[PDB]
Amino acid sequence: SSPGPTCYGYIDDEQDLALVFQGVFNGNLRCIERRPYDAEKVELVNPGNIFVFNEEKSGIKRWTDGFSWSPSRISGKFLVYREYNRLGSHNVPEYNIFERAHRKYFYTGLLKKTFSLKFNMTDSTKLETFHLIAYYTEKDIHQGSLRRPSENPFFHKFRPSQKLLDALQKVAVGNGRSNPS
DNA sequence: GCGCGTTAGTGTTTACGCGG
DNA sequence: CGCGTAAACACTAACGCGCC
Numbered sequence: 001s002s003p004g005p006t007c008y009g010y011i012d013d014e015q016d017l018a019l020v021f022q023g024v025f026n027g028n029l030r031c032i033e034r035r036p037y038d039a040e041k042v043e044l045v046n047p048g049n050i051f052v053f054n055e056e057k058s059g060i061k062r063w064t065d066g067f068s069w070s071p072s073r074i075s076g077k078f079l080v081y082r083e084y085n086r087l088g089s090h091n092v093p094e095y096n097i098f099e100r101a102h103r104k105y106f107y108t109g110l111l112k113k114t115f116s117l118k119f120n121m122t123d124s125t126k127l128e129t130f131h132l133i134a135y136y137t138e139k140d141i142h143q144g145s146l147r148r149p150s151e152n153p154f155f156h157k158f159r160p161s162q163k164l165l166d167a168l169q170k171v172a173v174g175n176g177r178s179n180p181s
Numbered sequence: 182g183c184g185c186g187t188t189a190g191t192g193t194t195t196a197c198g199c200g201g
Numbered sequence: 202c203g204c205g206t207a208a209a210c211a212c213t214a215a216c217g218c219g220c221c
Binding site (some may be wrong): 184185189190197 | 204206208209210211212213217218219
């Protein structure tokens, strides 16, 4: 079934995030308003797919796509997860194969990164929570087949308000020590 | 539909590695 | 130390099974 991604591309840094969020605040980019159905979940997971949803307005606090994910790792201010399956007995790279006893599993190459932003949206300081989910693949990192919002003319009009930029820099995960090259 | 035990998503906490 | 990685752990939403 048919509601789809909020936009298409790849998120690398806060500038990419800011454009997507601003695009959502303006109303050009449509957020997810309800949890996907079981059959809708299978389609979510396509590379380049980006989803944004308001926690309060949608009732979604945790995003579920029905796939198998590794434990969370930190990459800057993002959380990253890796999809894994079990073997047959078709072949895959050695390093991508592991074995949680007793059975043997492998990493597919599909990846998910997440980001949460708490941001004022009227008077007072009641805060709404915006969730961002982005799917991509290792392969798309080599080929560079996915477009970043910040290098995509479509997002240019979504130039971020300073309040958004400030809110984004205030964000941290675990110890604030994660900082990949 | 509802109750209830299990799994999983989202982080925090704690531990590991190393330049110099 | 200061910087950066990465595994362990804790919380509980969300799932899914039984019901028959």
